Design a protein around this ligand. Sequence first.
Ligand SMILES: CC(=O)Nc1cccc(-n2c(=O)n(C3CC3)c(=O)c3c(Nc4ccc(I)cc4F)n(C)c(=O)c(C)c32)c1
Ligand SMILES: Nc1ncnc2c1ncn2[C@@H]1O[C@H](COP(=O)(O)OP(=O)(O)NP(=O)(O)O)[C@@H](O)[C@H]1O
Ligand SMILES: Nc1ncnc2c1ncn2[C@@H]1O[C@H](COP(=O)(O)OP(=O)(O)NP(=O)(O)O)[C@@H](O)[C@H]1O
Ligand SMILES: [Mg+2]
Ligand SMILES: [Mg+2]
Lengths: 275, 308
Amino acid sequence: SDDWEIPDGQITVGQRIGSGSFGTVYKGKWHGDVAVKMLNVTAPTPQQLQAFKNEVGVLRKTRHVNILLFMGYSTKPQLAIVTQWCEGSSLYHHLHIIETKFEMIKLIDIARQTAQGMDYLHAKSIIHRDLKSNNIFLHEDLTVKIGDFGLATVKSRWSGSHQFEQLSGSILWMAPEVIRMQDKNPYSFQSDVYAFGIVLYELMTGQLPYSNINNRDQIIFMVGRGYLSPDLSKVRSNCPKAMKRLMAECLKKKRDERPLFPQILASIELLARSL
Amino acid sequence: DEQQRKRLEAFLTQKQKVGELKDDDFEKISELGAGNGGVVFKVSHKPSGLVMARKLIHLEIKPAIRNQIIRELQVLHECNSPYIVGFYGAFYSDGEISICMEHMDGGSLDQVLKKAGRIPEQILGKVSIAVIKGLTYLREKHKIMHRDVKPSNILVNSRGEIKLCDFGVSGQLIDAMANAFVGTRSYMSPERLQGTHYSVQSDIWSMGLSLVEMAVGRYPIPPPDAKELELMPMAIFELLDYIVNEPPPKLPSGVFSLEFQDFVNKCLIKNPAERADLKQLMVHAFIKRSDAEEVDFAGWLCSTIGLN
Ligand SMILES: CC(=O)Nc1cccc(-n2c(=O)n(C3CC3)c(=O)c3c(Nc4ccc(I)cc4F)n(C)c(=O)c(C)c32)c1
Ligand SMILES: Nc1ncnc2c1ncn2[C@@H]1O[C@H](COP(=O)(O)OP(=O)(O)NP(=O)(O)O)[C@@H](O)[C@H]1O
Ligand SMILES: Nc1ncnc2c1ncn2[C@@H]1O[C@H](COP(=O)(O)OP(=O)(O)NP(=O)(O)O)[C@@H](O)[C@H]1O
Ligand SMILES: [Mg+2]
Ligand SMILES: [Mg+2]
């Protein structure tokens, strides 16, 4: 395939939804409700543009029940992204805003589907780079849908032919090696596994990590230095021991000790049976 | 003095003309600025014709916490000093916390810095006096501390005033803010990066760092190059690490007076206890001198911006 570009006059941009780490989302129309994210890199370079096109080509061939569909892009008004529009609230809204009260069965199931989708993404060698409860939607309250995966070329504006990842996004899910931004490519499968570990912390504690640290830059420095770690004491009492042990494995400071998603997905399913 | 007492009593008078603050009573004039946190518009309160600055913080927080933030914000009614931006009222509507304050037609010293490139030492002396007195009023009269001193939070106006703004008064608002995207630079003191606030001294560090930046016209972490200095993209984690494990920044030796250099040097001592406190800075040689100088700040500001 090739030209995944959407012309002008085909996208009915609607109410402004909100801005995130690398774009501002509007609810547009395009053969049905869609999510139009106006990228921050509105003026892209021809080298950055072609890299963005290549990555769009890899994201379009993704199809999984736990993955938000990637429908292409547009560049008429400004560079934007067109993705499947999701009903209901995100996982972040359920856990930390709406304070929905799930049962441990449903919580572990949400962790399973999330690992399911993540396992599919890594199966196609796709690094999410921004895994968090904000990018996990519960379509119809039942199924899980991961969004805002990939898109490394639209994150970290380029200079001409370089893309030095200027660390952006929410810091709570960033792995230490990502925080430091020191060795070549910090974003790896294990960096996603770490973020997944922080999502597990969300599910098993109902809190965001570092509930006693209200300094953004203090968390950045201490987490990057290996001084700060999510306090696992905050895990609910009804949480399975095996789940807690898996969470601790995903949050290992040294990324080489974190498991991959095939093993993670197996551990979650095993402890879901013995329940 | 007297002119300050006039203006303070005049602000309270105009503030009493403002009753309940509703989203409909505001008409949007022009945008003033924005940044990792919210956005600020210049607005007109139709029930009283008053022109105010309205900051809009969009936080995705549970309502219980949001209600506590609004309640905590009402302390700002007690902050009435010529070095603190006037506060009209804070409320919540359409999913955004709105905090309405007095309009400063000069803007933040961040914008003034860009329009000016560098700010003269004579002017930074007046700015230092204002910041020192502002922090003092917050420390003594309210036992609250800024916790976010930087050029973007020092406001100025055509009447020559220099006021503090965006200072930490709502604990819950700080916690909710803690879940934000990483910035590009930090004025945080080293003890706060490794620990917690150490009294007003931690704010004095940020004041010093802001002075160095405004004096040279460039964020001083890392320090300028050898020939970048005679010419008068570091990672965020490397900046925080440089502030913690590297010697503090300083001013060029030949451009600025010794009193000023020693002033910022005592403000940037990495150990918070050895660092100078408000009591020491108030009677420092640089502040003593800059207080006797008759500098026309309002004229300089309106010239730098382009007003008459
Ligand atoms: C992790 C982290 O950084 N936490 C943190 C750390 C220190 C500060 C803040 N904080 C903030 O950042 N802002 C800026 C971003 C908008 C505020 O405006 C802001 C604010 N407003 C405000 C103040 C004074 C007047 I007079 C009018 C106003 F409207 N008040 C009341 C606050 O009590 C705080 C606590 C604010 C947040
Ligand atoms: N496909 C979508 N369908 C519906 N709502 C969406 C969609 N994508 C994003 N949103 C919402 O739009 C708002 C902003 O989203 P977004 O720009 O992705 O910021 P974010 O997800 O919170 N952080 P990030 O995803 O890393 O940029 C949030 O309220 C999201 O829940
Ligand atoms: N009362 C005010 N009067 C005039 N301009 C204001 C006022 N309050 C804020 N501004 C402007 O709004 C801009 C952004 O507001 P603010 O949310 O405080 O961001 P910031 O302080 O620049 N950086 P940050 O604290 O990281 O969000 C500032 O640079 C000011 O120029
Ligand atoms: Mg999202
Ligand atoms: Mg501010």
